[model samples]
Target: PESADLRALAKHLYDSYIKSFPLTKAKARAILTGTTDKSPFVIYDMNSLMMGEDKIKEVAIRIFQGCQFRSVEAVQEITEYAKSIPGFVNLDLNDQVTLLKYGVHEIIYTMLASLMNKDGVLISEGQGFMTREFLKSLRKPFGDFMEPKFEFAVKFNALELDDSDLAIFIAVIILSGDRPGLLNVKPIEDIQDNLLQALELQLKLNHPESSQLFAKLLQKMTDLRQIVTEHVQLLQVIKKTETDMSLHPLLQEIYKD
Candidate 1:
């Protein structure tokens, strides 16, 4: 089994990278399709977790040497598989709606929120890809909305909704995706445009009550920005430590592929 700290770190990186684009689904598509360049920190964190600190720095130097490419499809595929387990699907409709709405912002926020717990422990003794506590803690953050019996009702309504109603539904999905801790799942590149249009509509036609909700949501986005930024900085520190000590054994083991 992997160390709890390492597993949490991996989850954090994976969740944050996927959820970086909240407002613009087009940018999210560009990111997932390899059309746009991501921050070095994004790639750095993933490589560090997959390979090790030393190899991550080595790869970073290569980027400095002018070769930069990311396997967006590979990461997307992995994310899909992560979501395949009951852990992801078990979330309530409201949670799923939050993920769809907030896009990357919600997903990353929730994953980190969950991971920050002192009592949190990774559940690696199972068949699935997720850690135990990671899924367990997700209940409130992701599944707290709506009754279990109404799960199908909410999702069905969401799918059947016109773009306007869908926007609100998606907003809730985005919120759930990023809550509790870090790992988030979103629509692939093909679905980006429609998704963004829906969100934009929701943002634009804010009623008095809905406008307040939008304000709160925007505030949450700001908070997410701050949290992700801190994590990126932390990755830099980890990179420096690995460079000085050559202690990134796990990274090296994973990087061999």
Candidate 2:
């Protein structure tokens, strides 16, 4: 059936994306913290965490670098995946960059959420995989930047969505027409409708008890949007305050607008 074909096509895109890089959950955690703990991510002892101007800058630098690393790797892979979509290449050039500029970070982090468990995730492909308690032991100044992501991740993981569910959800985020400055809207919008339908079918076939599961899975996009909004704000703060180390050219361009 045509419907089955598109769904297969969507999954094929996802498989291609999954192998593109090592920006997995472990790396995400690696950038976020050195220790893990169930304690609140906020700092009560600000003085100790950032003792000196030198210390603050070092701490800020590390956090900025981690975010930049993820962003760089993410944009590279997503750009490749975008062209593989049937109608995506048919869209306007600026529109493609525009969509990627705003949407890439969100999409990258959303996919990263899949690697998360309620406990702290691995730092990369191998090794400790870090504990919640130990992640707290790391430099504390970066908390505000990293904690909100884990907070959101934990909530999202609780959704218990499978890969089939996640595959469609990821598709929806990328194909969304609401991305700012998207001049080529109708085709992307139509593509989004197709993805949404495929996802509905996915739930029907895969989810044993999918009553509100589809509805809730859609809500994850909203949750991810809010989390990424927080992410961009943190980037802005770092961009403004930490003038010593410039952002990567790609991240600099994306966050500038």
Candidate 3:
């Protein structure tokens, strides 16, 4: 492929990510601490860990509800973003859905970097800081499903990818050809290869000092798969045991895989 073509593709991906990228930890922290200004979003600080049995459950339900509400919007965001990727729309419609179904979790996990540190993740659009210890306190499926994402985000943030780098990374995740239900593989594979080339080239040019950065990022994808795998397992438990806890309709459908 011509370098120019790849460059244009990479640029398009970059623009799309820049537009859709959510609140970053730095930005969120600034607003939370009243250091800089935005309309204040509510903070559900888990550190105030409650004093009662019912109270704990009540907080857990509220936290989970906040997440579920945001996830509905996120699904729409990713779907639009995916449509903008070069060659993504050319795939069979079913293949496109398959890719999104398998890949949305990975992208969401990647995007979580903005609102996360090793200690905790900011939720409710950066309104609340949910600490690791607090999440673990929730017990079972909620804590189990969330902990690994925090673990992944801590290391992922260490790579220091700016939004431009993340733009390509998100494209790479959604275009992955190995997604199990993909009916048309070769074209998807070729698009993914082009994306990888563009990603490698972008990293070398933009993040010059990190020799292993690209390799480490690819490893993160594998790491993410493990998280998503565990996510599905926990979802199973949630379906049977936590029946009252509802997911967004799209999320309910996506997890059907």
Query: For each predicted model, how many residue pairs clash, with residues at least 3 apart or on different chains?
Result: 34, 15, 2
Stretches of candidate 1 above 4 Å error? 1-106, 111-211, 244-257
Candidate 1 local lDDT, 1-257, one digit each (tens): 33443334334433443453232333322332342233121221333334432433343333222201222222233345335322344655555433432344334343322212222211111111222233233333222211221322222322222323323333334333234423443433223333333344444443433444444443444544454455444445545745553323432332222
lDDT, candidate 1, at 171: 33
Off by over 4 Å in 3: 22-34, 38-57
State the lDDT at 67 in candidate 1: 9
Total clashing pairs in model 2: 15
- lDDT over C-alpha atoms for residue 33 of model 1: 32
Error of 2 at 22 (Å): 5.4
Judged by lDDT, which candidate is best?
Answer: 3
Give the per-residue Cα lDDT of candidate 2 at 158: 75
lDDT of 2 by residue, 42-139 (tens): 22233433432232245445544655685687688777777666577787888878877776777777766655545654432333243443344445
Tens digits of per-residue lDDT for model 3 on 1-257?
A: 58777777778887786677566545754654454345343333443533222232467676677678787788888888998888899889999999999989889888877677666666656645566677777756666667888888778888888777888988999988888978889999998999999998888888898898899899888888888888788778877887677777888988877
Write down the lDDT of every candidate, Cα atoms only: 0.33, 0.64, 0.77
What's the lDDT of the predicted structure labeled candidate 1? 0.33
Query: Candidate 1: lDDT of 218?
Result: 38
